[PDB]
Amino acid sequence: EEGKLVIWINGDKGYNGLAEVGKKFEKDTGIKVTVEHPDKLEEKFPQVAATGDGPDIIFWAHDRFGGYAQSGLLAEITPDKAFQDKLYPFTWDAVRYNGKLIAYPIAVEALSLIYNKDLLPNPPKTWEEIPALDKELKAKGKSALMFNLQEPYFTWPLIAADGGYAFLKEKRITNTEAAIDTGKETVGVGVDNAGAKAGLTFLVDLIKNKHMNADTDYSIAEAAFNKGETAMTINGPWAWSNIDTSKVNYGVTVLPTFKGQPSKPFVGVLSAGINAASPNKELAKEFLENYLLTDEGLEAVNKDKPLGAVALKSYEEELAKDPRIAATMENAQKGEIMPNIPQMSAFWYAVRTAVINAASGRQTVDEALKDAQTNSS
Numbered sequence: 001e002e003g004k005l006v007i008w009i010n011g012d013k014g015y016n017g018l019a020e021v022g023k024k025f026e027k028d029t030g031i032k033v034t035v036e037h038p039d040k041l042e043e044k045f046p047q048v049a050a051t052g053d054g055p056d057i058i059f060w061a062h063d064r065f066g067g068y069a070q071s072g073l074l075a076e077i078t079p080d081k082a083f084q085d086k087l088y089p090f091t092w093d094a095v096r097y098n099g100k101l102i103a104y105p106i107a108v109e110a111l112s113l114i115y116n117k118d119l120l121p122n123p124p125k126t127w128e129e130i131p132a133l134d135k136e137l138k139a140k141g142k143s144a145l146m147f148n149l150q151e152p153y154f155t156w157p158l159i160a161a162d163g164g165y166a167f168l169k170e171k172r173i174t175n176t177e178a179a180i181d182t183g184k185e186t187v188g189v190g191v192d193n194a195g196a197k198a199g200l201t202f203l204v205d206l207i208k209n210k211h212m213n214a215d216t217d218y219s220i221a222e223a224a225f226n227k228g229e230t231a232m233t234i235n236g237p238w239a240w241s242n243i244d245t246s247k248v249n250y251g252v253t254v255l256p257t258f259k260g261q262p263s264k265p266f267v268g269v270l271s272a273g274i275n276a277a278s279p280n281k282e283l284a285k286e287f288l289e290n291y292l293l294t295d296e297g298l299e300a301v302n303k304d305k306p307l308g309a310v311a312l313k314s315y316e317e318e319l320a321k322d323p324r325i326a327a328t329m330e331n332a333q334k335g336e337i338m339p340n341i342p343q344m345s346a347f348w349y350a351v352r353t354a355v356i357n358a359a360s361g362r363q364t365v366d367e368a369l370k371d372a373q374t375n376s377s
């Protein structure tokens with residue numbers, strides 16, 4: 001409530017570094033800043049903010065913030081020209097919804113292919129090499145690739161490579177013969193097409209040929225890679241800190257091509273929104289503008305867990321030499337900035353089920369995506 005700041009940010013992010021910025025805030029103002037990382041934060045915040053509660057500040061990829069804003073859960077952001085000029089204009093665009101700044105862009109997240117340089121001094125260029133490459137590491141007691149198959153974020157780069165798309169926009173009904181001609185529908189879902197089917201088909205066959213397991217989650221994949229058990233993983237910059245502390249010599253590189261096409265990751269801008277129910281919106285601004293989005297604040301979070309390419313131009317210029325940030329930004333450039341509209345939540349839920357269903361065998365790829373296509377719209 002008043003005289004304190006409560007902040008929510010995901011557990012895989014640099015929440016201890018952000019607590020340090022929060023302590024720097026307390027030291028200067030006397031205002032306590034608590035940072036918490038609840039599970040299913042993106043689900044819990046709309047539940048608890050809608051009743052007027054949850055945190056003063058919420059951290060998530062920008063794709064979820066259009067829903068929060070459309071439901072009135074987010075305050076409008078009030079940066080001056082001079083403060084806006086300090087961040088990249090495309091980072092501001094991701095947190096613009098119905099023309100209003102509804103969050104603070106923090107950093108740019110894109111998946112990259114992370115590989116173990118002692119098992120794999122030269123990473124593979126294409127997805128179609130991994131099968132022959134997994135069977136070669138199986139003769140050394142290892143495997144080629146593991147990544148989280150339970151979240152569609154991780155499989156979308158392959159799905160999108162040869163044709164899958166999601167250029168979601170809410171658009172009005174175009175049917176002369178409906179009674180109601182004033183409502184909107186979601187256009188731009190592209191998951192029941194040839195390109196998406198081919199992408200997810202390749203993934204199912206890896207599982208069917210025992211190159212991956214359909215139950216592999218974030219934790220299983222992370223442990224296997226950082227224990228030297230699989231030669232490659234797919235993850236974002238936040239995952240780098242745990243590999244640094246592991247004994248794995250790792251590289252971060254471009255995702256592999258599929259049928260000659262670049263993998264297209266969904267790009268996220270980590271965003272800091274101010275709860276529309278909060279009584280400390282001016283303290284939230286203070287903390288965000290003058291403590292977090294400074295070199296020293298972003299530096300505290302980034303060396304806890306890497307943020308990726310930071311939205312603050314002054315600090316990104318220092319990180320830009322990092323070849324891992326080059327890989328991040330190069331993948332991000334082959335992919336697409338996520339839409340932020342409210343139906344985004346339904347799109348992710350649809351695609352998650354299809355991926356889990358196709359991978360486990362409950363549906364064919366063909367059925368899974370046909371269902372995904374209908375649910376997303």
Ligand SMILES: OC[C@H]1O[C@H](O[C@H]2[C@H](O)[C@@H](O)[C@@H](O)O[C@@H]2CO)[C@H](O)[C@@H](O)[C@@H]1O
Pocket residue numbers: 010012042060061062063064109151152153154236268348
């Ligand atoms: O898989 C669907 C999920 O993908 C994205 O979630 C990412 C998030 O962007 C990252 O910050 C990181 O924590 O990994 C998450 C995937 O586990 C979307 O942001 C999210 O809305 C969507 O549901």
